[PDB]
Specification:
homononamer; about 50 residues; mainly alpha; about 65% helix; transport (chains A, B, C, D, E, F, G, H, I)
Chain lengths: ~50, ~50, ~50, ~50, ~50, ~50, ~50, ~50, ~50
């Protein structure tokens, strides 16, 4: 029947990390993760009036 | 079924992004996405906030 | 059966585009698409837009 | 059981075209297609003008 | 049992080590293993000031 | 996958032709086909002449 | 079907040896095998070698 | 039946010939085939007719 | 154990020979085969020439 295997994602993800490396992926993720920081903050101010 | 797998597109798309890179693909998409901006605008003129 | 796959064309087409690139393929297609312009015109002398 | 697949020719033909390219294959085919032009011409008897 | 193979990780891990090498991976691991040293120490110091 | 397949020769032959090319293979074959010309001639005396 | 294949290790080991070579692997092994020499000696104090 | 893989040798042999080429392999074989010439001669010294 | 997939060794061995070549492997083997010469000589007691 249909394959649809999660293991396929692990091998693919590994290749992506190796080609982009892990150190570089850190700056890219954190750089693009700036928007996430805002969502988290809005859904949890805890500080302002 | 196995005949039609969406996963095949994920792996192919990944290769395309790696070969064309992500930064370069940004300028290419935005450059070619100029026409889209017009469609969005036109379908938004006849509808104010 | 399990030998005729439409997906086979997608992967092959992708390779062709990458090897020939997309920008270069533009000039080649438009250059060779000159004959098509004539067919369209002949099958349509007038045009509302 | 499998054995003779027409699709096998499509993939092989694609490789041949890519390795030899399409522009180069044009001159080679037309250059070697000179003999064909003669056959067509000679058999022009059974073809009203 | 068919899919889901632990062995898949061994082959993948080997590739990662070869591409990143073993000597280089040493400095990277030890460099990033600095945080681990703190966890081990805290869970061993058991003596606040 | 597969066994005792004639198709294996087609793919291999294609590779040989591409690596050696077709134009070069022409001179090599004709150059080495000189002995064949003699066999054909001898088996075609038709008369003492 | 059997993922657990001993033969997989032979092919992988061969690649490692070729990439690292055999002469270089000699110095690396002997250099890192210094600790082993001590284990052997300690477990054989009552037996000079 | 089976249990053997002769075709495997044909593909491997082809690769060897392509990597070493055919012209170069000629000099190498003839150069190393000098010993064979002696065996043939000795096993023909007794009497060629 | 053994007597299976033996063909896997032939293909692997071929790759090793090609990567290390045959001429180079000669000096390496003979150089490392010096110890063997001694074993053969010592066991000359129970083996006449």
């Amino acid at each position: 029947m249909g394959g649809i295997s999660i293991w396929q994602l692990l091998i693919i993800a590994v290749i992506v990390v190796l080609l982009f490396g892990t150190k570089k992926l850190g700056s890219i993720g954190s750089d693009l993760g700036a928007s996430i920081k805002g969502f988290k903050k809005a859904m949890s101010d805890d500080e302002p009036k």
